[PDB]
Paper text:
Methionine sulfoxide reductase A (MsrA) is an important protein repair enzyme that specifically reduces methionine-S-sulfoxide to methionine. The Clostridium MsrA (CoMsrA), consisting of 209 residues, is classified into a 1-Cys type MsrA as it has a selenocysteine (Sec) residue at the catalytic site but contains no Cys residues. The CoMsrA structure folds into a common catalytic domain (residues 1–144) and a distinct helical domain (residues 145–209) which is absent from other known MsrA structures.
Dimeric CoMsrA was purified after substrate treatment to determine its crystal structure. The asymmetric unit contained one dimer and one monomer comprised of 204 residues (residues 5–208). The two catalytic domains from the pair of monomers face each other around the two catalytic Cys16 residues and occupy most of the dimer interface, whereas the helical domain lies distant from the interface. However, although the two Cys16 residues were located close to each other in the dimeric MsrA structure within the asymmetric unit, no disulfide bond was observed. Thus, we speculate that the disulfide bond would be cleaved by intense synchrotron radiation. Interestingly, the active site pocket no longer exists in the dimeric MsrA with significant changes in the conformation of L1 and L2 loops.
Residue numbers in the entry:
A (entry chain A), B (entry chain A): 5 to 208
The structure:
Amino acid sequence: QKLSIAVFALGCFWGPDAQFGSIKGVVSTRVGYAGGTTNNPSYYNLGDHSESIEIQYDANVITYGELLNIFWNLHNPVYETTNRQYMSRIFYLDDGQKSEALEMKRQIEAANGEKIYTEIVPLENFYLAEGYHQKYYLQNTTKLYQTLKAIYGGFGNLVRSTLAARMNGYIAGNLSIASLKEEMDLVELPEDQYEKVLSIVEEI
Amino acid sequence: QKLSIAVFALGCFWGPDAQFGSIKGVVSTRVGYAGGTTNNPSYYNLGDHSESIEIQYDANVITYGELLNIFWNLHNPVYETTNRQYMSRIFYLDDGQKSEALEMKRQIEAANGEKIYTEIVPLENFYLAEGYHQKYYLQNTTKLYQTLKAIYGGFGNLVRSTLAARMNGYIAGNLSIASLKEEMDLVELPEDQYEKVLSIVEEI
């Protein structure tokens, strides 16, 4: 009922959304634009914003430390770009995150003698990305998608769900099918649906 | 000595560059920006351009028909965006490509009763993307990268090479290691290098 929120920025948000969304402890994901000053970001109209991701996670299952580790492994900001704006950003929500981040950045910068160009700033506003970016890899496979969209009875219902992130994670080649079968039963849906959902899945 | 060139656009060019670059018959890849009118595209300054990819392929091994099939499977442009600009574009270089494309688009639009919003226009200019986008997933793994960068004796030498595309393809989870071992010997480099290159590879 009460969870924790991380807001990261690491280039295109498709990869992340399908990566984080396949990690255990990750409850939900939304991709969007954060870091800028305009009130109207869109995919080709960022202004000063950056392609970002908001991860709703359970601190009892996954730490902000683990997340930061994934964050700096999913990309390499060890090059100076930082052109016009910043591709690599960490948006902290409380001082807890701000200090772990400022510390872990200091760790790699020391353990590698190589300056990391990740920005650590306070989250001012996260602007939600257009619907065709939400659970991208999932939305592409249109049969699995339209099936799940019905089961959850709405677009928004699906993309907030943990299961979509896992599916979208699996399709992107970021999940062993066995783990998907687990996350599938954790919903406990009527067997007709299950088999049908699982049906599209075994045909790969 | 003489090859064929396809120029596609399908969203972020990282995925593609690592996908196409792992298909047999694909000689080289460059990511960049095409489709616009400004003479100065960059990652956050596209103008009217779109994130594009240029694939140098061998028509004796792979057809433009096969490429177009990969192109329309790697993404789903069956949604109307097409916002401000066009994410999904096919840049033809000769009438051969223009007709296969205009035909294959007509095929799916019929076989699915669903309008594809891919643009088919003549290639006017392909602007090369910044170096940190070239063989992205490869450049991230900094040991394998700096090793290969030395073997090829230059940055540009590596990214034009077939092997980098295959490596960058493998790292992105788009290649069975066995196929990488093949593409590795097709270069016939001194065994000290081989084993060292293969060494970083088995540690995954």
